[PDB]
Scaffold this active site. Sequence first.
Site, PDB file in Angstrom:
ATOM      1  CE  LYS B  63     -41.354  32.422 -51.248  1.00 26.85           C
ATOM      2  NZ  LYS B  63     -41.969  31.399 -50.456  1.00 26.85           N
ATOM      3  CG  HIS B 191     -42.684  28.211 -44.278  1.00 28.45           C
ATOM      4  ND1 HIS B 191     -42.755  27.238 -45.258  1.00 28.45           N
ATOM      5  CD2 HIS B 191     -41.581  28.990 -44.545  1.00 28.45           C
ATOM      6  CE1 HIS B 191     -41.734  27.406 -46.112  1.00 28.45           C
ATOM      7  NE2 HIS B 191     -41.034  28.462 -45.678  1.00 28.45           N
ATOM      8  CB  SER B 194     -35.633  24.487 -47.868  1.00 28.91           C
ATOM      9  OG  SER B 194     -35.048  25.807 -47.848  1.00 28.91           O
ATOM     10  N   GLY B 231     -41.065  23.830 -47.621  1.00 28.01           N
ATOM     11  CA  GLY B 231     -39.746  23.415 -47.071  1.00 28.01           C
ATOM     12  C   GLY B 231     -39.300  22.050 -47.646  1.00 28.01           C
ATOM     13  CD  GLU B 268     -48.691  27.799 -47.170  1.00 29.33           C
ATOM     14  OE1 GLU B 268     -47.520  27.937 -46.710  1.00 29.33           O
ATOM     15  OE2 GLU B 268     -49.632  28.488 -46.697  1.00 29.33           O
ATOM     16  N   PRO B 269     -46.031  23.388 -50.815  1.00 30.89           N
ATOM     17  CG  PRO B 269     -46.422  21.610 -52.261  1.00 30.89           C
ATOM     18  CD  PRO B 269     -47.067  22.352 -51.057  1.00 30.89           C
ATOM     19  CE1 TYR B 316     -32.264  39.018 -52.608  1.00 31.95           C
ATOM     20  CE2 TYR B 316     -31.140  38.336 -54.645  1.00 31.95           C
ATOM     21  CZ  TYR B 316     -31.684  39.323 -53.831  1.00 31.95           C
ATOM     22  OH  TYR B 316     -31.610  40.605 -54.260  1.00 31.95           O
ATOM     23  CG  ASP B 346     -20.180  43.103 -58.981  1.00 31.46           C
ATOM     24  OD1 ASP B 346     -19.322  42.696 -58.183  1.00 31.46           O
ATOM     25  OD2 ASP B 346     -21.162  43.767 -58.567  1.00 31.46           O
ATOM     26  CE1 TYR B 374     -38.727  30.494 -53.558  1.00 33.45           C
ATOM     27  CE2 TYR B 374     -37.844  28.296 -53.198  1.00 33.45           C
ATOM     28  CZ  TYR B 374     -38.874  29.233 -53.062  1.00 33.45           C
ATOM     29  OH  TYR B 374     -39.995  28.858 -52.396  1.00 33.45           O
TER      30      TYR B 374
END
Lengths: 407, 412
Positions: B63, B191, B194, B231, B268-269, B316, B346, B374
């Site tokens: 993700k 988890h 970060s 993280g 899970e990096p 986010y 905007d 991200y």
Amino acid sequence: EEFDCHFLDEGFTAKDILDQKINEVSSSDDKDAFYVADLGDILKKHLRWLKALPRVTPFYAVKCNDSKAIVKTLAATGTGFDCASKTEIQLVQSLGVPPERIIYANPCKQVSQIKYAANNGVQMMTFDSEVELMKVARAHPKAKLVLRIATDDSKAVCRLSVKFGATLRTSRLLLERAKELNIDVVGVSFHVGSGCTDPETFVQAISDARCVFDMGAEVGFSMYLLDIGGGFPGSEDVKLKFEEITGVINPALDKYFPSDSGVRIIAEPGRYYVASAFTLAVNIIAKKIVLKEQSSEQTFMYYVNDGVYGSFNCILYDHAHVKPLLQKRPKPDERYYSSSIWGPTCDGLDRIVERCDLPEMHVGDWMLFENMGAYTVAAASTFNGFQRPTIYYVMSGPAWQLMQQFQ
Amino acid sequence: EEFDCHFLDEGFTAKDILDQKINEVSSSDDKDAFYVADLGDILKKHLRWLKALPRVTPFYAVKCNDSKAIVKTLAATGTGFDCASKTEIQLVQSLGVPPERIIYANPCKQVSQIKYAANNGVQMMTFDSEVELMKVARAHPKAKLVLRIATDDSKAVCRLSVKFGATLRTSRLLLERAKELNIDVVGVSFHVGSGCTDPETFVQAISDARCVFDMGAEVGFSMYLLDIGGGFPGSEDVKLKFEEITGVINPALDKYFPSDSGVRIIAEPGRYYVASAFTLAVNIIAKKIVLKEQTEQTFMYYVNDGVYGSFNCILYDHAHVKPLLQKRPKPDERYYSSSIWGPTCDGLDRIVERCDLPEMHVGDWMLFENMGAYTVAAASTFNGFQRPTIYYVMSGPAWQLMQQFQNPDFPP
């Protein structure tokens, strides 16, 4: 043309087609979130704009909801479009609409995009700075140009110098500078916005732009185009309503912008046309029972299959306040519990409703969110793999009657 | 391939390709924003991971950045994959990874997507609640489940519920309940995330995980799988660096989970692998000057990507971005208080509220490093504005390391 658009059968509303789609899947997993979108609701909004604001031409703000079914329902209705980029000009261009019904009302535009508009027949644009005049000169010298002035009526949090909108002072300057350039400037635009507590900000906006037309005049500029922007409410779930604002707009326009003066008046409504037309149904996918305070109930956590990366980005970027609704029919008179409601993603801050009171719900029940047409599907992504809800477009026989006059 | 990947020539690098490409463009512009993505930087990160955390097999959090070239690179390199949805399982299985190098690590899954997993051979999933166990008992009763436990760490803000993670007390009830549904629980995950300030949070979570393993044993599980989550920082520009975290973790794994006890240890990096790999270049498209101050001294610059496209990360993911000049300075040039804005219509599409920059000009380029995590993955095309095209580069030496990993490679 290639969108579903299902005429409603003779007794049926858009709410009934929601109940039908949920009953179809009653036994059969595939409970993905979906919308029901009432193009009949949108054709009502336009009729109501004609009565409420008979001198003002509506230019639909495309960014609000760019779905192809919506633009084309509106293009058959007589609206213009407010477009901010090459792909919105192209969208509306492909749906058959002329040059003459677009305003390119982005004050700060990339130069290749300026060049695209001029090559495709698009002439009216907005501006609010020297560099911008500078750019148009070079890339669209025969463009017709609307100067954007500052308003007020709130900005979200103190911060210093606002994104768009000239001073009267800088407009004094900008009118002169364009005079130096041989650039035709024809009008004034402002944008009050949907965080309007107070309708007299329009009057104030309108009054401030007499000033600027009268400052058009002393330099030699002959201006007619008045653009009063957007920010009108798109449901009845707001405290200041559309016709309360428009009561104060009209005799403002009458005092400052008399019809026998020659003026043309447009606006750029976005959420007014589409907000109430869309209802969102989401499924409850996961559930926690919190045995709460340090088959056994006290507080609840519910997880649903659309979130803050999808449709509920609106709660972050647009300040929306969403309201969960059941369409289980209420029981005899049922207990409520303190609850929260979470998005599907693997992100700890994908959270839709931090606390609300609901009856106890179960995995596989449906929740509804009404008034979800504006700044919702337009800014969603597919982060974490979760797909966009499919939209079902519908229309009564009576709204098609309404459509069928003008086209 | 199908995507845009090029090999580098010898002493020529990703930062070198960047410089060039803005210097081929200079006239007849269309000067759209773009990325350079160095797939060799992913191979560096992997060799450093295997050195710093030799007991720990990494499963890439898809993700964070789901670009197919990034996933195909990681697959040939041999990582596992952390998938959260049906479309992420599909992407990885479309590259030929086997189901055993997947963990379906989303604790709250839609029933249909649980059935997709079971129809496709993905056996290992996470959970943290009794309703989740119910769902698994109906749609995927042979799954191997991994119990996700709550972690600590201190915050941004202090609020009514945390989305994921059972407490120790909850965990004991979940295990008895699994055992009564005849569902196999095989291990524990957590988890930290970060914004850990304190690497001691890893030491506490690892100790908690050993307490759930022992609760397991008491009711008859033989647990073997420990998953320490994600993280870890993706660039050198953070107070708490990677190898400092790994140097508390390592001795706590040996304390609580010795090699002779049977255990298999994964993680899970997500941002660890990809943050530094992407550099983004945006074009100044518009500019405004604000003089002497009342409630030339200041400038306001408009660029062609923003908080709805790549810089959604500042909303986010809490990111702090650091505008870099590329137009190579001028010795001691005079700097100005300065704001940077996205292209949308905007008034909240703003990227940097105040930097100090030297007066700049429409058509100039500004550079943003460490933009791989991200960013693209959460970008939309609000207002019609299009995503920056990405250019993939790799060195000849990174391509051969990848081949020396290139990873059929193992079983019996």
